[PDB]
Amino acid sequence: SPQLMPLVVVLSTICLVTVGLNLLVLYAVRSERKLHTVGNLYIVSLSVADLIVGAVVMPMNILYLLMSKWSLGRPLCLFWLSMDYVASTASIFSVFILCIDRYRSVQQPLRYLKYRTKTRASATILGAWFLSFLWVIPILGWNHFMQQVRREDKCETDFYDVTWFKVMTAIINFYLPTLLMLWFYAKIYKAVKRQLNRERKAAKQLGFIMAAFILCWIPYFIFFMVIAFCKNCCNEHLHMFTIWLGYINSTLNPLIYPLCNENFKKTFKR
Ligand SMILES: COc1ccc(CN(CCN(C)C)c2ccccn2)cc1
């Protein structure tokens, strides 16, 4: 309808800045070579997840919004769902891994003075991405293992019509990472407040990532929490607004990176 165009054309700019800035960060870590550290490898994983979610989901979601009917074939809708889930889980597991390694490095090292090097970073990143693909394994094939889309148009997840699995997977994937990683961040806060500025800059960039991936995702997951128990509580506009708040998180992370530490500003200016 010729009244929703003003919102769609704005989303194109969001997509363009999302893909560009993550690619700019990957340019920074590849064309400067003064940032090949394990923590910067974790932020590279986070930026790769954000670049994937941008370059894949943003055009597909924009097309879905500007044309309220999916006729791009069933396999491609499943591919979009799988890549969206991969990117989102890879992001909130790369941030989880970064927080875990920060905590185990500021753990008053008494057991872990060993390698904090390419070995551990590679192992943990590959583990997180394999867990994301493990999530993808059942979503693509739903009827194959469990005998549970039945909709020619308006393609969505296969498990949209089941409440218990959706609630359980949302609770796990958000609450367990957010609670465990908040506990790790509070332990980091206490340990750093026991030593003590560069640590303050790192802690504040982690805190800004915290603010973005909490206050940008809470509306979406509270919408999942409320939607299952009452189908009268559904609002299409607010659902898309929450999903785009999550994508605003994904595009804010590349703005969190250079606004905190002075190393990225010089690497970006050139
Ligand atoms: C950063 O944290 C995350 C992690 C995963 C996701 C993927 N999504 C929905 C994603 N939407 C955009 C379609 C779900 C759906 C059900 C239960 C859990 N996550 C979102 C946010």
Curated annotation (Swiss-Prot):
Q: Does Aminoacyl-tRNA synthetase appear among the keywords? A: no
- Top-level lineage group: Eukaryota
List the ranges whose topology is Extracellular.
67-74, 142-163, 230-235
Q: What is the effect of changing residue 84 to A/E?
A: Loss of activation by histamine
Q: What is the effect of changing residue 173 to A?
A: Loss of activation by histamine
The transmembrane residues are 7-27, 42-66, 75-100, 122-141, 164-186, 206-229, 236-258
| Location within or outside the cell | Cell membrane
Q: What does the annotation give as the result of altering residue 34 to A?
A: No effect on activation by histamine
Q: Outcome of residue 85 to F?
A: No effect on activation by histamine
Q: State the protein's purpose.
A: G-protein-coupled receptor for histamine, a biogenic amine that functions as an immune modulator and a neurotransmitter. Through the H1 receptor, histamine mediates the contraction of smooth muscles and increases capillary permeability due to contraction of terminal venules. Also mediates neurotransmission in the central nervous system and thereby regulates circadian rhythms, emotional and locomotor activities as well as cognitive functions.
Q: What protein does this entry describe?
A: Histamine H1 receptor
Originating organism: Homo sapiens
